[PDB]
Amino acid sequence: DAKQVKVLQLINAYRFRGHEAAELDPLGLWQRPTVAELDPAFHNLTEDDFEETFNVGSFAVGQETMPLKDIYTALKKTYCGSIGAEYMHMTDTEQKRWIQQRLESVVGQPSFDKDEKRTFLAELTAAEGLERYLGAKFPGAKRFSLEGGDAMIPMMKELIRHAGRSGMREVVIGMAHRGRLNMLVNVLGKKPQDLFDEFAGKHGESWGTGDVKYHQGFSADFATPGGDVHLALAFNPSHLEIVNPVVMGSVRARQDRLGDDDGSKVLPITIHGDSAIAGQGVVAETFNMSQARGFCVGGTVRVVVNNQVGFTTSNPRDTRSTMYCTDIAKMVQAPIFHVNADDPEAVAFVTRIALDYRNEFKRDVVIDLVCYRRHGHNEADEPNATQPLMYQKIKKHPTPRKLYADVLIDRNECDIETATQMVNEYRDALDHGEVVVKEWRPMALWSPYLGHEWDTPWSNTYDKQRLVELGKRLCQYPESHTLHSRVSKLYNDRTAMTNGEKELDWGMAETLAYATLVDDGKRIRISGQDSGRGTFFHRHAVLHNQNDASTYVPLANIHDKQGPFEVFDSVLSEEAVLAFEYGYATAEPSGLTLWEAQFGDFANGAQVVIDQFISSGEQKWARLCGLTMLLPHGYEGQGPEHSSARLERYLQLCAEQNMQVVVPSTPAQVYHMIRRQVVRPMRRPLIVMSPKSLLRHPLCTSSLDDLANGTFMPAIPEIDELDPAKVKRVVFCSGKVYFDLLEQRRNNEQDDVAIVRIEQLYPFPMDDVKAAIAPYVNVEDFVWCQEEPQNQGAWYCSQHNFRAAIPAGTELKYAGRPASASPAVGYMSVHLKQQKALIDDALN
Amino acid sequence: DAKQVKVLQLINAYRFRGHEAAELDPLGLWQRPTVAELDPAFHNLTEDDFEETFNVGSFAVGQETMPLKDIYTALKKTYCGSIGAEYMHMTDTEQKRWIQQRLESVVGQPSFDKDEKRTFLAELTAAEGLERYLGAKFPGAKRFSLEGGDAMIPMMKELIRHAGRSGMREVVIGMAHRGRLNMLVNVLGKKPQDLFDEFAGKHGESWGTGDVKYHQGFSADFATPGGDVHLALAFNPSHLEIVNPVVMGSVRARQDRLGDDDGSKVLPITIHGDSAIAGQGVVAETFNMSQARGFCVGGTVRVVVNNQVGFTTSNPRDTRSTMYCTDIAKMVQAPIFHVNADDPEAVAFVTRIALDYRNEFKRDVVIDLVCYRRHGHNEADEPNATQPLMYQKIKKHPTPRKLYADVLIDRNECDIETATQMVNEYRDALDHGEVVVKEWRPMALWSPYLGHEWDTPWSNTYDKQRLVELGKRLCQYPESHTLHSRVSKLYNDRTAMTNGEKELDWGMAETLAYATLVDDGKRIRISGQDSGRGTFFHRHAVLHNQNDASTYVPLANIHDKQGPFEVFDSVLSEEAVLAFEYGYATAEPSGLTLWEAQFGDFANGAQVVIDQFISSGEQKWARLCGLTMLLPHGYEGQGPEHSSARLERYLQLCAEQNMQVVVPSTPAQVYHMIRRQVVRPMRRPLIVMSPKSLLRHPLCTSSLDDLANGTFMPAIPEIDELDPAKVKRVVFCSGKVYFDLLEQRRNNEQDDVAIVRIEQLYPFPMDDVKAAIAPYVNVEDFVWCQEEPQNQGAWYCSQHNFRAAIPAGTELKYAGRPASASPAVGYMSVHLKQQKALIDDALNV
């Protein structure tokens, strides 16, 4: 019959658009626009057709032939009840068929054991009960209450029980304020008495400068039917979405260490607010990384706490441009399960389906938990002033605990005395103040401490013969591989440096430093835009065959039993990428983790990660991060965005030994700088002003002797054979400007002015600067020289450090570019005239 | 008839997935994976069925019944040739039927007039010819050549010709490096000789410190069959996608000024690279704004220069997580037209469809121009070292101009002599150096210069009876409107302030300042998270009815003929939002344009806009931007992210009078500060350290007399009746710390130490500070006091300004928080101890 074809189009119409008419809002507040396609009359089916049997076809109901009365009911139960599945936009036929099997076979309605139902009720009770307790015990205090979205707690425990049920070993969570204290107490097993002690202010005992209670992270073991599973909740700042990239980098470092090439042992989970996930662009930057080979973690389960309001903003036309906040997920074709949070069984049922999807297909999946915010944005705020109707409806809306208990009683699946005792047993458990999570376990088996002082001794030396054999292996590539003539010219030059015929350039000394690290079995993860070859054609860590596209990585082939070596050409992001590498370095300190800006000027698109994480995470959260940032830097006439890494900004952020700001000027210096970062037992961030023109400067060279038997020099004394008595002025400087100073002093045959580099600006190396200055007893004045404008660079932030170094009688003077609004002139002509001007002011 | 249902599923398979098998790559380089659904056998159609006639259904070919062999030919011609249409993900049925009509009715192959074909050939000729000329005249110089994507120039001229053809009046373009120099010369009408002089370095005659040649913008009139259309190409920095939000704010200010409610008179256009559009999150932030009220511009035409490489990265698994760089567009259900760039008629056909779609449905549309990059990422780079196979293929790939010329000749629509002469006539036109755009026209009639010095006089005073009458109208609301009792309590307090019963609070003086600005007919646009009510429950510019949802905006109801007033609750973005307000303010200087951070700590997620636009756009591009940034600031024990607007960073960025950094401490000061921003003839950015606790501080109050008859004070002298001779120490300070200093000095019964506010830190008000210091001839030492840690705040950047101020005998000292990695402690208890310590260190002598 033609009607059998019409039944088939109706079935797909619900699969495409049934979620648009689904009962997803707990409050029932605003009606959904009608969709004609969901009505059989749109397909010319009438009541006479409704009594006739039909064939389901692809509808996976488990009965080949059905009356239309049950087919129409099955479609509404599957696609228009509590669950709104948005998945047909996906192009993979196997994945869409897979989701149809999960939903359509059960006809939407899920089945759980009565013990499973009693667990969801107790988990709702713990969520509501902890929040009503804090509002009584600490009225008015800022706790970002979960109330109205209490199903997030049973959804989360069901995720973790389901992770161990399918063999996952670790779960890493990154989230925001909403439900944060409920997570700490009711899933991660933080003791309630310790939460009560923080509200009273009696928590103490640290020189961590600290952070507010709803930014804290936690760790615990958590019993699951598959056994104990490690749990980790990240620290995060107030900035709303940026923790998500950091958690992605942590789990990748975990998956890399464990040899989990399919991310099936470590489950990442991120929790988002509905307004934050739509407005913040780092969400899309992270979705773009979800399958990038250098950042993929096997897929993330993403849960949105969609309380249909963001602070005081509730109009959909003010927050976003689409019907759902989750539509950003369609960029990577993620299935999206909207679910009513007043239907806990639907929440757990969609939660298992979402996890099963992520593990079957190793792809991101999103759970839209549609709910409400019972109170104001925080408990001191009045929501009626801006959402009067939403809170007149919430004020007469019963809690999800009460609602679910009413359903189990109607179905004779529970009795009211059991539901009542859970409310009171939980309140008594909070009064005792001990852990209230049944499933919590003490962690099973942390040293070595990596907070040691920057001037701690380290093994700078390396075997000179081992260093040359490493260099020879780097120059070797398969004979069949054919290099571009410029790359083989470069490896031919590296072959001469290994023979002693030519002093090493910057790239060889950098490559050698990586080689000694993997030679000792330590990991190297490099990341950046065009980091394999290098923006300035200097690295060439990856060699591409000129016949086929095949690559060969000499640093990955040094010897068997080497530490792993990876260098990824990153995606066009700096915010999410630098946050990813921050989470990688903190989770796995032992190796070298290095991010490379293509120019240091672009690093400011990750300014939140620099401000709220790198420079401040130790004082705030006791986190040590060894991440190294290569920021190309130097004034060469290329204009405002290709001159300044904003060195002045990193120096301004320096305090309390939080960071290292280094400006190497020699290939040997960058070699020792990189090894000290791994070799020295300190893991604090290394901000590097990477050279550009110095990669090929003829005077910027170092012998093999300088690497094997040298050390990193925080300050470098005068190098030419000046007589110390003859000096009348000492010029402090950093970076390439020294090389312009040196050649001009030699061209003048000037021996009355010494030049002293300060390779490490923070922490300031006091005695190394004084030691370089000591021989010049006749000195009368000192000069700070810099290519950079005076309102930028090291001048404003490092004046007191230089002044403390110099003898008391002498005064210090400035020589450099004038202060300016823009980092650099746009014209090359004006730049060279400025360069000659400042170089002459310093030497006269 | 069972095969008839199978034919319909085959037709929809191509509508859904034909683009996966389309020939989109000019190079033919990498084969695409088979989609099973596109071949009939998958649907049990065999050759015997191919001879039978079938019903096309909704297939819009213009014939209801067709043999299957010709339905299959029509489907491959429509969805598997040069055009790859991705639109079935959209949920609006009408928009899908609209696209099917355009595409299926021409059966893939579209028809153009012979003049239109000769125009696309000449426009391809100018695109190739200009770049080969620059490579000949200036070998090795960095010009980001369009070559391989030459189809872009005819596509752009067809976008503009079709805009005026349908009555649009302005077109505003924002783009990147790729094809930038070709855009200026061959679309915008920049003189080639001025471009050649910039390559030679002979450009001069400006105090703009300037920028590189491929960041410059341009303006022109452009003849179209419907008449002249204004053209505007934005200045942009090197940061790749950030210009896009700025262009959205520029056309929105244009649509607002023109009374264009639906943006049908001003067309926004954005051009993107394949790697940047996938990696940068500001792209998704702007897509989220496309239908937000208060940022919607009626839809943007977005063009991707998809040359399948970004610098040295060409592997898809390293650049993105999806098959197409454009898949982010699906977040807003934008249709996406992939098109092979070696088929200019396909490019022009899809370009007309994209504009017609954007004007019919006022929604974003994307044109994916699939092409190649003929040279390296720039002309000094070697691309073979990292993409050997792509450049062995490009090295033997003929240019789009030659390829199109071969097609017009093979079809006898053109002759080889006509195509040859275009190549040579164009090279001669470039040698002469005059404008080469035939459609270019001189602009028709920019004089109230707004770069005047910050100390320029302005009309600070306002009539006091009008100021009180403005306040009475602000307190009036409709009888049917019902306020929440806290809001009615607040307007009753404002009703008391208008009568003189009570001094004005911070919110009343701020609202009053807005009222005087709209009262004189000037525009006010405020934007920021929860900016309607205010994060701190102080503004309440929008009044929500407690019975229905209706709003009432008292500032929009001052009197008829007032300037428009708008206050928008922004999206949860700061980067794309602050870039949008930068483009609004720069395009429309005359009014007040204000962005409000929810806390000043959150502005650093828009740090690129602050660095590359706000702090540097005047020296780089001669752009005046009057935008005001409200950044809440102040140490109150709320922690590292709720204390510091990073004042030290803005002070570090101050040079060459680029910005204003102000810390008002009185309700009257913010009133005069806001009016000075519009009433004074200067349009430079205003960075404001907004108070938090001062909004309710009993001592932070001002009389109506201070607003009507006062003025903004860059520095505020001692307010208490101290005798100058008895003073022994002067304490400089700004912001709320003054009130902690003042209240402590009164509790101590101390008359030996004066306290002087410095409301404007940059540009530094020298003589006003010296004037405040003059009476204290007996002073022995000076102190800068600040809540901030010593490495933050004003200490490092303003030391020389204070030291040059003080009398020669005296020396300057510091009193404030110790330097720290974090902006603020996480514990309230600790906060107080530090506050009492620094306040006591300043007052003890």
Ligand SMILES: Cc1ncc(C[n+]2csc(CCOP(=O)(O)OP(=O)(O)O)c2C)c(N)n1
């Ligand atoms: C990056 C960033 N910008 C601004 C803020 C200030 N802020 C904190 S919470 C909030 C609203 C959050 O709305 P939503 O995402 O829906 O989360 P909810 O609290 O409603 O659960 C805003 C704008 C922030 N914390 N982070």
Ligand SMILES: Cc1ncc(C[n+]2csc(CCOP(=O)(O)OP(=O)(O)O)c2C)c(N)n1
């Ligand atoms: C925000 C930002 N990050 C980094 C850079 C440095 N950069 C300039 S061009 C480029 C590659 C651009 O690739 P694509 O988007 O495809 O544009 P194309 O030049 O190939 O057309 C990079 C990483 C930049 N200009 N802006």
Ligand SMILES: [Ca+2]
């Ligand atoms: Ca961003």
Ligand SMILES: [Mg+2]
């Ligand atoms: Mg919310």
Ligand SMILES: [Mg+2]
């Ligand atoms: Mg590209």
